[PDB]
Amino acid sequence: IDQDTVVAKYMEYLMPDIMPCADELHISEDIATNIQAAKNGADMSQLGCLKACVMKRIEMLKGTELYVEPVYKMIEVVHAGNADDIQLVKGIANECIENAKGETDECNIGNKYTDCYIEKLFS
């Protein structure tokens, strides 16, 4: 699965749902800054939340409850093409959960869950 399909799918899959988040606090942790933030260059402190808003939008983040089940469902279509490619991202999220271990602070949970997502899947 080309990265071009990864960012295009995850985005188009919730495009009308991602625009409200960026407007929620101010800006999108992505356009926040090309590559001058930290984790991936977009953001980190505000990323673990501004971008985490898209998570709670699909019933994956309940205040401080970091889940992944709803994601396991979108990874199915979001990663159309191969059967294992979907099975790969599945295990990837696991490394992000064991790392974020459901922190107390919202931005903290996301910052940890986002970081790992960039290290393994990059997106």
Contact positions toward ligand TSD, by CB under 6 A? Answer: 7, 10-11, 54-55, 71, 123
Min separation Cβ 31 and ligand TSD, Å: 12
42 CB-contact burial (10 Å; exposed 0-12 / middle 13-18 / buried 19+): buried
Min separation Cβ 23 and ligand TSD, Å: 16
Q: Which is nearer to ligand TSD, 54 or 109 (CB)?
A: 54
Cβ-contact 115, 51 below 8 angstroms: no
Q: Which is nearer to ligand TSD, 50 or 55 (CB)?
A: 55
Query: With the C-alpha atoms ordered 82, 80, 59, 112, is the resulting torsion angle positive or negative?
Result: positive
Q: Which is nearer to ligand TSD, 48 or 105 (CB)?
A: 48
